[model samples]
Target chain A: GSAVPFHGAHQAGIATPVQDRLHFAAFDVTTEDRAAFVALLKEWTAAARRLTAGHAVGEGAYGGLPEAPPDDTGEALGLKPSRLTLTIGFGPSLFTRFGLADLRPEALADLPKFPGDNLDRARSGGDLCVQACADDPQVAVHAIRNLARIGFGKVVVRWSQLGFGKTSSTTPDKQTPRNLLGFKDGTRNIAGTEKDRLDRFVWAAEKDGTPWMTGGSYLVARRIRMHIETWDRASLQEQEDVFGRDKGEGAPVGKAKERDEPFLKAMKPDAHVRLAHPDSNGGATLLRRGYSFTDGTDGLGRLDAGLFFLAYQRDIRTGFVPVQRNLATDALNEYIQHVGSAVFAVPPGVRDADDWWGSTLF
Target chain B: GSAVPFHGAHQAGIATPVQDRLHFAAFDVTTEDRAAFVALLKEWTAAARRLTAGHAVGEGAYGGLPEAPPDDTGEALGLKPSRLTLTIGFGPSLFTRFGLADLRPEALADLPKFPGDNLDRARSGGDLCVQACADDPQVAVHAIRNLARIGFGKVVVRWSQLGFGKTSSTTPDKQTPRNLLGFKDGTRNIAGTEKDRLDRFVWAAEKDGTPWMTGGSYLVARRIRMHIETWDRASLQEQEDVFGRDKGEGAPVGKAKERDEPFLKAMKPDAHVRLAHPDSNGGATLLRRGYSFTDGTDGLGRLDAGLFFLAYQRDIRTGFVPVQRNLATDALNEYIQHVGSAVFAVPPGVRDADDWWGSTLFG
Candidate 1:
């Protein structure tokens, strides 16, 4: 009866798609009313589930009143926008467990098997509750109304944020990639296979964390908007030198996948390589869980491409935070910008009435 | 083919739940190698059309490549963000038509039928544009890529601006007839009785702007992010006074039909008595052409609404621009932000040979 949903990754370095964007967020609170907020979130989430349950929503029409729908409803409008990303970032203070300072390593052994985002132990940007949708506000409002009735309204919420960073693009010089050091990086990344994706991504259940949080892996969506056209304009040779890899087939400069260590482990690897470095500025490493977002054209001649970057770590310092600091010097920075960013303490593992957040928290 | 498309009044100020959004735009050029850019746009748009023509996109799993779709691929994604205006603001210089002196008078005439504040015809900030779609970016990218090919590598254009300045209440102002001002704004905005819609919203061949632009009206969508919750925090009496209408029915303080003028006219018959005054803090109006975005739940606390604002104007200024200026001082500005916007000129009419913007302008 219960299954988790997934959202495309949003990297800290780029702007998300600007069109019909449905921005939504939720948070877990810790004040005296924290209990109340959690309760409301649960109630509304259930309500939303019910409302969305059996929703006769089909392709052609807007399902009316959740009870009756007219034909060709969707057809009425050529197309409509609909999207939602609800998240809850833990506050810095929530790290204490069973009357302890940091989560004991032993405690980590007891962690649940849900997806885990260990680095975001607790911070203040996300909500404990959220509802994000596109193409229809009523559905969003309807859900919000259910929660507000119980008092999950103490957080600061805004639907839009100013995007002020430069778009990630290929350097104007034209030849860089691979290994973040400007050598073709991904050429050695396991190519096109289940084993490859598994190798490349984090596995929540396998990592050392709370068992309750097992099975759930942290999702780091770094929406890195890139300047593809600029990249396309560069000479292939220069591109190779900058990225440290081959552009045509993504092979490492000196060897193929069968022979060389993947860019992530290059000996004396170019810290500035665009291929393997965490920052792609100076040499650094962090697990990468990211995707590319090509929002429609921005008239200001700003072509965007970066990474909707996501990652996981046992400690923010040794994990996500420091790697981000490393990226500041990434040679690839010449073509990209870290304009929009958000770090969340992604919690995982939920299986029914037994593990809802509140009972455990209180 | 002759079925009257969604346009004008249907898309104007009213919120028709039964409507689906249609967005199309064309762009002109003043940048370098204008011809090359135009050629690029042509090539890209065609590519986009080709991709969507019979592409069979695959779903049912995460991160799958979109295969070619079939002819029935009515719902598809493009390479670029086109007309879908969901929130805040977006678009390029083309959205600044209101600022152009050549288009001033026409800009003023384009304001919506709603009454309220008056902004300087020429000084008003140009309308902004943003696209809102809940689809995968690849879909949007595919479309935009083709468009860029058309623009010869440069293509950034927004579509129509429609407005959704009203809503049924969620509180502070809970009422049976909730609408903008917490009253029912769309109660009577249902589609027409005949096979088509009301004649008032349409322009027969004669009223159409240009010869080639026949049977079509420019769709202008403005994503005016409203802070209804902020308004809900206001006192009831304050809400009543600013709206110049009853809090319960959205009627003029005391009127029927939900559309009749009431205490508002009694106070300032000539002005928009409702809070929608152009000079008010919660001010500014925009012709919207937006679609709602619904992505279900994410644990973060989320706001209830975003505007799928849409507007249809024959000329930029005379139609949509002036109305927004009035909203600047209107009652709604207190809790609203014009975050997303877009303006694309609906071309002269292209029944044949994909109407290239360059061809329309230079041919």
Candidate 2:
């Protein structure tokens, strides 16, 4: 029940650990007034700190003014913190408003349209984002839902996704998880404990262009929709061949254990692993923290199921873009479509009680 | 993570303690041939037994033929069973085919359209249903998805729901969970261990009319969409008055504790709890095992979040109808709409290894 520290050198969600559930939301800023926007940010910071520490927004939910709206929604009252972590990020469009254009990091540009992307504009972009994760679904939901409630008129929800059964493991000790495609993912992912790799590939160091984003990283959120009906029809060999990994062992082609060095020639020309591998993309790697989701049905009797893919890195141009460009002809593309996309410049974590999210920019 | 037994006097899901997550699916029977339809049932029965016991079907995913499709999807390979339970039911349309009209139970009739209903026909009715519940969401989803895979030809999925955070508890040992409305639900629900109440209000005994439905029960699945934005604007006092219970303690208006006998007179005439309580409905009670769901946005800038209500009782005529009729005037109706519905006759349990789900009727 002990909560992760809300105030830290970096946001907890990126590398702390992966939780079982996620409530990810994107918001649009409605206010043009600087003071009002800054006040809401301060309020959100204080409320998030309380929520992550297993407390209410203010004065607790009970024994408060009987006539007033309770500051905290009481759904998660008796629940534990469940290792909840709330991470904040600022999208590219956010800089266009509030006269903060100069502060936008150059690396936080819009992601290029990839092949086979049927992107939905409404779900693609946003001004701000809050990723709430927890071991318990209700706790995660309560954090995002209450924060949205507090933002009332100043911000509105552009899109949101509820994800369960995390698809990627953040730590080396944890077992790799399976996506809806029924294949194990993130077997070769960068672990949180690898400090050298974290500095080299993940954290945006001073050498990077933006100074305010020095301790922060870039986030790429993609709503990848899997065509389950088609994938289910594929043969076991064909399915395994698509991913270039064994279905059961999660081992690379011609390899035994999960972490064995992959044999590129062992796979077909368009195998997914070969194209997305760091070796093939000039050592470009990302910290993946994706989760599986099923949003009911598509009204055509097919499941609207896929991965809400999340990746973080020091820069997008060198990290995600080139890697995605290599996968333009991946065999896995036949079974998946990118329906939503966004890129956010994550600000450094709250330094102390005197600091707040995105304080350097605001 | 140990799997619950698949065979019993009755199915496990009805009374075998609630799981944390659910994957409920409704299927339309595509085959008109009686033998073909019967064969799929056999395949499903075999698959269910294997899945519920934490084993793989036939050859499984890994050791199976490499060239052919894996009998089991490999997703759940290293995962525990997570107490997975699969319960199957047959809807009214199922009986109207394959000379099954004579086998249809009188208690398994179509539910009457209740007041303030806004049913979506596509999501409403189906020929069959499978309710998969488990501690792990992936395991639950895998069981249902694989079953639908095995049933590719004989049945097509009509609709499905993925539920998280159970809204009701079937046992006393559990902490009463809350619905999306932020109020504790099922404070006085019938316990799974209360055999006396189960026999009286839940199980369809042999003494009742239908012989094929002995030890079976009726299932009522309702997709109740909560108007969260509207409810969020209401004051705490107004919210409590609508449900006739203190939101924090989940107790009746005049009670100090959750289990105290609700004071009917203390509640407003249109209060939700008062209208739906068993005492006011001639001792009618349901074994509730619902879960909260959010199916993304409503395409109009609002959340499509609410309760996927599942209730089991001896008969719908006396169990769900009267209580719903009483709630016709309930105040809570303003914030919720029953958008989906279906009624099914859950057959008795497998009974033994040789017995299938609907064996009594098909055998």
Candidate 3:
């Protein structure tokens, strides 16, 4: 019901409790001038600070000069903050034009083409990305729309997605949310309350040759299109076998409860949990904050529905790459395909009123 | 939130309090078997009853036979009812088949083409429609998805639209909502509590020559695409001039408050409110439950966004047609276009546990 803190050591969205709605937008930087792009970042930060605090941008939607265009889009005038969090990230392509190629973090390298990947070029890469999460969909959408409006000449939306339901939870104490497949997801995800886990697995270190991204994390966004019609038609037994968990309780194959440690061998060889488990990938874990999306129909009458998977890690090489490679043989792969993909070097948060997004770099 | 009552003399969605989200889907019927279509309607009614009461459809998404496809889709297992309402409507084409042409309501005729209409055939017409409105988007989506799943062989979704923010409120006490253009809309909409207005403008009567549709309403759905980029660039003064209202207070041009009686003479002749007002159009009023929508990009860098205008009335001829025709010269038309259009003969609501949708007509 209240606004999340705008100033923090690490960006709020990554470790914050998952919101119910998501409006993620990726932007293509049209401006080649480094100084102008830096100035835009500062301006965006000023607006984000005001927005996260439940105030409008600039002079707001009205009561300004009547002859000029309104500074703020009045759609969200009376709306609450709804616990909105806006997280910014810089993509690999952004560095190419901003004369900051040498400053690019190694962990932000392009993701490899995994097996069975059918990526859409139009929706895939971007020069920048912003993840807006809030309890109210309108609040989240308003944030993204206002930012895009402010970036009219400097940047344009490359691709965008609207997600209705959150699929993962950062607060493990809460009930784990189910994905589009209806199975409880993110049961074993890195929780925000676990400080040791956050430091070890999520936050990047200065020793990684990217000092500016020390308190930040690398973001990997994958749009996994679920074959819902096919999955819905599968037998309950087959569905349980694919996830290696029972449908009702979400318990492991040999356990009676959802949180019980799994006996990995008791499950099928290609079980998703068995392959994606931390033990299977050398203790590598990802802090997941995914959301479910349905974009009308797929032109073939079936729902273009799936999970917009968002993960944050200390490094991509040791976190997402190995785990995704292990999932190549996963039984759940039959019902899902990775269609849109992106990676971003999320810099540390704005520490104070004087600090801004990417202030450490630019 | 608690569930809205499922049994009623008239459908719940039209006059019920507007929800925060909407998932309106139109379906194209494929089955030619009239009896089978009637059976599907009964099944849909039963499912809707359970759904609106915050219960899952048969078998509760789990604990059923492993061999059978689960009746519930499981996505909304633990969700609250969120005041969900499922209102079904019969399109004109639906009567052409199923041997029910003679029973078609006269007020449900095909909408006449309006000025500046760029109707998309794929999105315009439908054999049937179900409007699912709920406070939570997941709940609304879940209702439509389950209904479509049940109608697998009998019907397929023609085109569906999802709306995030409600543009109109049946409860006039609440603040009026802003449209994509950022001006308060539906300030003059009929309130849900106004029974006299509801009976006169929204609900149909037996005298209308469609006994089966008595107490029901005629729904006009128009997908108006707003040119947001162009509209955003307009000066505040120009934007207000187009709507005939002030941006902040939403008051009429010569008035000081939103609820103040607007003097139509003070507004420009082509102003939206001036031309569409009841004073200018023979006192024809509509019960509007419109919603704002943003459907990604329009392939040309602009947002494919606008208002999904939904209006209900006793007669489309006197309600929507005349008012729309009068709006041909509206200044707001420059920033908007009617892209998709549909009209449906919504049937009376189920009166009891024994009553099903369209039971009166079927008998």
Candidate 4:
């Protein structure tokens, strides 16, 4: 978009107090020897992570060097060879930030830190859990870019004040929308409140995993790609018939309810976009928190999707499942498809402040 | 293409002297609009441009702030609209920095400064013409999120830097390459010399456009979708014959002199990549000021490219063109095509700092 206009900014609202989470991985950065790459990564000064949370800058404000160019080792920059796979975890960031911050180990280690990232999705309480994998690594650079943007370069990030990250999961979360379609999907989450936000927001953070994983949540950041051009070309009526929303105002179709959004129980008969979507409801409702991602134009007049979806919740079984399964059958399904998706258990707010994974309480 | 772990930074060589230039825009903003977006974008403001300059905690960079939320103003972050457009000539920022900050009244009046935005491709320095399009008026939350990360709400960046105000005319000295390939190409380039550095690197003042526009160079990042699968499936020797430089070392096939950079001579009879490409010469070289880009993986795989190419030269004409013309018959043309490209006339630096685009003077 227009990086110069300074126009595309705003705060996001949720009908329900939800959280966003994310899980990322460096793309295709595999190792003939994992030990070799890990060893190299270990040697890197955790300084980049410090760089993340180290500064605070604002609009019309100036700090740091003109630009903090990528550092020497090149892990955070574009100097690494393909195969450096990254397995990003977002909801964990939420849970870790919420309460785990208090649980961090007195003496931290050099591990990936499990859950410490920048910006606590939960301001007050929660728990988190996360896992990492280097399985089948024949991917490309897209993962690298998305994962890097997620938080690998630095753990220190200047969080937006009083903005989007409150969730009910034990962890934080992340997710983004498909540019091809108009409706947002559920993913990534974290709740900020006295009650365990995950317990507060998550339909069943307790059932997803376990007690230790209570505030800690599970994340399933799926890349749901939409056939935007095709959808945009459809008539409003035809479009509404598909999404169950007013083609004109994007309200629920055939319903006069002011509260009638794209999807609602009353809007079902007319056909709810999410109703048609198998992912919306099924026994589960993922407290989705995501963003819209773009690589560049395809030149052939095709716009694509980006990554880094954020979701937070304690239970993986019931929280993200039913909804994802439901969306699979969503009417919007025809126009969009889940191209790439991953499930990760984001750990907790890193170990040491300078730690990559940071100091982890989880 | 690697986004993470691919930590590749560059010196950002300007290779040309700092020239006088100016640029700025007011946009149709209520000013309140900027604040609202700042709130939304602050959510992703970690390591953002504002942070580069130094600012306070933004509101957009959060996820649990019950206080602030996403705004739906029926506007997009990067959709190019056509509502407001303005251009300022060069030489403002430089003057101001050099104790000549008098703003040029004429530049401010908006005297039709290349209203078409037909930035030069081979005719010296100019902006990427297409970027002239304004932003769209409608967008989604995710779009807003991205804008927040980079801290670009509704950014209308006006820029200026070293280069000729008036560039090479569309009419080429001669088609040079056409009907008779490899003939008149590369003939218009300045043979790099010690004496030429001064004319190419002279520092200057800024214009009404801006002082910040004067010394700084723009980053014309691009990601052209090349038909690689198509090229990959092409005949092998055909690939060999068109690409004059031997596929192995890439040296001009059978060349006795190692220093010879091929574009200087005739097409090697067997260089398949050369003749196959009707788009450019066999050897087109531009300053590669590339930045890696990636969204996520897809079926065909994560659509990735090397910021394709990053080339730098003070004058778009002298730096990017001549070589491009030679590459018209470039063997690589058989496989590569310009799917997407952007030209940004970056303004000069704010202070006497660093960069390859002429760090010594101007700033």
Candidate 5:
């Protein structure tokens, strides 16, 4: 039941230990009134602080007026805190709408269209986003549902995704988890324990382009659909060859351990690891917080299962863009397709009880 | 890491302690060759026995022929068994095909359309089903995916649901879990440890229907979607009234404790508990095994969240039917929509070395 502090120098989710479930929602600000939008954010910050600390919305669910609707849905009552963290971000479109275009960070531009990208408009973008994560699925779901309820008239849900297994390990001691492709992903991810590495690669410095984004980071979210049926019939050698790692040990090609330095020459010309590694992309790195999702089945009998890829970086111009571009020609692209994309500027975390989620822009 | 016996008098999933996750898939038998169909069942039986025993499918995922595809997916290699159970059932459509009409049991009938049902054809029925459950989601998913992989040519997946946070408990001592409604469900369910109750309510007998169904039970699966938005806006009094139980304690209207005998007279005329209670439905009861599911958004910006309700009974005619009929006009029906439904005749468990899932009918 230990709680992740709601007020922090940096948002908890980026550096906090990865949880088991996720409920990520993107909302469109439906109102033209700037004050109403700010009021909603203020309300969200207060409710989030209470919910993450294992308390109900307002005076608890049962203590409220009998005739009035409960402030909280009451699904997560009596549940452990489960290390819950609520992360907030502002999309590029928000700046364009709120008469605050000057505050738009130069690095918050839309992600470039990648090769083999079959994007859907409905699942693509939004004005604001919230990332609620917890060890219990109900806790995550409850948080998002209540926030959505509070923003009933001011904002509408543009899209949302429910993710199950955490696919990325942001710490050194934790073992890497597998993606739907049945291979250990994020074996060489930037660990949260590496403070110097994080400052250099993840957190935006004061010298960065925008003043409001001095302590913030840019988030890139992509919905990658895996062709599980095709991958299932593939031979083990070919599958391992595509990833450039041993299927059993998750070690680099021609290596004995998972964390060993890779021998790039031993990998195939179009191997996924060789194309996406920071070594191959000018030492460019970002923090991964991805999760796996399976959304029933597609019209053609295939399981709509894949990974919701989330990454944070100091700037998008240097981060996910080049790495994703390099993988455009990678052989693994044959079995996957990028269907949804969005980029958001996440400001510095609140400093105290009086601060709000997007106070920097306001 | 303990293993549940694969070969038993009844299927493992029914009375087995509920696992934390489920991967239930319905398959459509495409091949007309009866031999091939029988061969697939024999292979499934062998692989399931090994998987449940915490072993690999063939030699091993990494030990098999280097050039050939691995028999087992390697994801679950170092993981614990986590109490895995693979329960098989034959849908009503299966008997109509393959010259097996004579083998169909009287209980192997398609479920009747209930009052407020809005079933989606794609998510509804199938020719056969496999309920793979484990404490770990990956283990359950791996089991079902491998089974579907092996049945490639003969069977294709019609529909599948991934569930977590099991909403029902089969043992009396275990604490009840909540559903999407935020209320504890199945408080008065049939416990697995009650042998007499299970015999009278769950397992089929020799004189029940067909010889092949002597030890088999009927399964009713309904995909119930909860309108959370609408439910979230309702007042606490209205919410509790609809369920006829306190949200926090899960106690009935007139009772102070969860397990105390409910005074049905104290509940409202259209309360959900009063209608679905056994005393109201001719003593009809079922062994409940349900799970919670959330399949992202429904394209119109609503969370496609719901409960995948699974129940087993000695006879559907006397069990889920009467109870469902009684719940037709229940107040809780307003906040929920039953979007998918299917019924299956789950044949007896494999009795011995020579027996298989469908041995009686196949022989």
Candidate 6:
């Protein structure tokens, strides 16, 4: 549970190895006052720095003034930092507020409605979002809980999701994690060590028209609900055909090993791997770092569970948009539906002790 | 990540060292035919055996007949056993449905409504229950999911709960865990190693008029929702006063260490620890094994979160009933509510490879 340094060239979570748990939250800005909102951001940043370092917020939970609410929640008092990383993002709706309409990056465009989206409004958009991830579920939860506490008057949580069992990995050499569907995901995902590919696909450049987001990336979150009951009923041959990969070894069609080069033409035209491959989408790649989640039963005796798909890229139009559009006819679509969608413009990381989350932009 | 033995004189979970995660499900029996229900029990037991051993259900999710659904869901493939324990229990209502009203143990009586109770029906009583605990959340979840799949027509999950960060521990030597209220819970809980206290407080006997329940235990589950926002807003002194313990060290009033004996008189009459202490309840004790849960936001911008309280005892009459009644005026009630509850008669564990979950009763 060593600390992942909060001060970095880019936010630690994007390239950092995926944690075991996630507590992602989207918040609606409640205040119209620009100064008040900015002050809250600064406060949140300070708190995050302490929390990620395994220290308490302001004063520790118990020794604070008896009359005031404790600065820390106390649930995480003795807990380790668990390599916690707190990444902040500004949604498309935020630019409309705070008189920053002119400064809105063109790359931060509102996500277009995809063909098969059955989006829930409550879980979709947010003025702001925080992606808190840690090795322990409680540690991740505590980080978000404290951040929300600090932003009490300025921002309220619109919706939140909890995920267990990471579905993707940033470290290529590690064991490939499996999604709820039980197939190894992110076999071809962008690795943290690939600086050349990251620079080209992940980190936004100053030449990309947003100077503040130079080392930052665009984030797209989709709550993809997998119809596991139906998928479970499907034949093994049919399931393999849908993904264009074997269930056991995760090898592509006409391949014997997991990492074997995928021959796209050998797979069915509508196979998920064939349609969403980088070759199919014009070399568009995203840093896929997602997690599997099971909320509860759907009240109809079926599990209300799925993958929380998180992808980071330099720009959405060329990265996620084109790749997702290419998946319009994917065979896997029948067993999965996109129920929630959001896109956020992530700012560059805090570089020094004095730097705050949005200092460069504000 | 090693397996807890599925076959035992008593169930593995009740006295086993608490795992890091929990996935508990209460199921409603859907079938009325006696043979069909018995068949489902045997099927479930077989599946549980494979799961706790880190093996797949039936055909291992693949390499089977392509026309039929895979026996295993495959999500748990390549995962360790994670010390997974699957313990089953039968509710009071189960007796009436399966033509065993005469065999209903008096100790499995339905839990009475306590003062300040705001119970929800959907999350409450069930005909049967399965408590799955594991070091890994996915492994625990996989056990329950596969069990439900095996009982497709015979049982349907009424409500299921997922919990992280165990709130209570059977291993007292380990660090005491905290509840959502930020207080050390189960400080004086019965330890798994304490055979004497467990026999007196946790396990039932044949002399109790339920011969079939010998070596068995009764389970009480309460979904206690802590008003964390209000609790978080309270002063440190007020929070400590509510629990009758220091917040930082979890020490009782006038004591510095967490395990020091409490004088009880030094604390407020209605303090949670003072009221719920075994001395105050005529030596009634429960082997508590609960967990903390957070189920997203409540749509009003507050975390819908709290403790999923689980306790085991020899009988409900001497265990949870009197103790809960004594807490009618607890100081901590202002910051918590009992939203869901269930009581079950947990039979003795399977003795060997041939025995099933409820074989003794059915026979």
The whole-model lDDT of each prediction reads 0.35, 0.86, 0.88, 0.31, 0.85, 0.88
Question: How accurately is candidate 6 docked according to DockQ?
Answer: 0.61
Q: Model 6, residue A180: displacement in angstroms?
A: 1.4
Best candidate, lDDT: 6
lDDT of 5 by residue, A1-362 (tens): 46788897788899788887899999988899998888989999999999899888866666567687788787776676778899998998888786898888888877777768999999989998999998777788888888998899999899999887888988768778887777888788888799898899889888886777777889999999988877777788888889899888899988899999899989998999999888999998979999998877676655568899999999998999889989978989879989999999998988899999888778
Candidate 3: clashing pairs of residues: none
Clashing pairs in 6: none
Residue B253, model 5: lDDT of 86
lDDT measured at residue B317 in model 6 versus the true structure, 0 to 100: 91
Higher TM-score: candidate 1 or 4? 1
lDDT of 2 at B29: 87
Off by over 4 Å in 6: B166-173
Ranking by lDDT: 6, 3, 2, 5, 1, 4
| Candidate 3 structure quality by residue, lDDT tens digits, B196-312 | 999999999999888888999999999999988888899999999998899999999988999998988889889999999998998999989988888777556678889999999
Q: How close is candidate 1 to the true structure, as a TM-score?
A: 0.52
- Once fitted onto the true fold, the runs of candidate 4 whose alpha carbons sit more than 4 angstroms away are A1-23, A26-48, A55-180, A183-197, A200-214, A247-265, A269-283, A294-311, A351-362, B1-129, B132-319, B322-363
Which wins on DockQ, candidate 2 or candidate 4?
Answer: 2
Q: Write the per-residue lDDT of candidate 6 for residues A1-362, one digit (tens) a residue.
A: 77889998898999998888899999999899999987898888899999999888888888767777788888777767788999999998998888898888899877888888999999988988999998877778788888988888888999999997899989979889878887889899988899999999999999999898899999999999999888877888888899899888889987899999899898999999998899998889889999998887888876677999999999999899999889899999899999999999999999988888998889
lDDT of 4 by residue, B147-176 (tens): 322334333222211101100122122222
Pairs clashing within candidate 2: none
Candidate 2 Cα lDDT to native:
0.86
Which stretches in model 2 have alpha-carbon errors above 4 Å? B166-173
Q: Show the lowest summed lDDT stretch of 10 residues, model 2 chain A.
A: A60-69
Q: Rank the candidates by DockQ, best first.
A: 6, 3, 2, 5, 1, 4
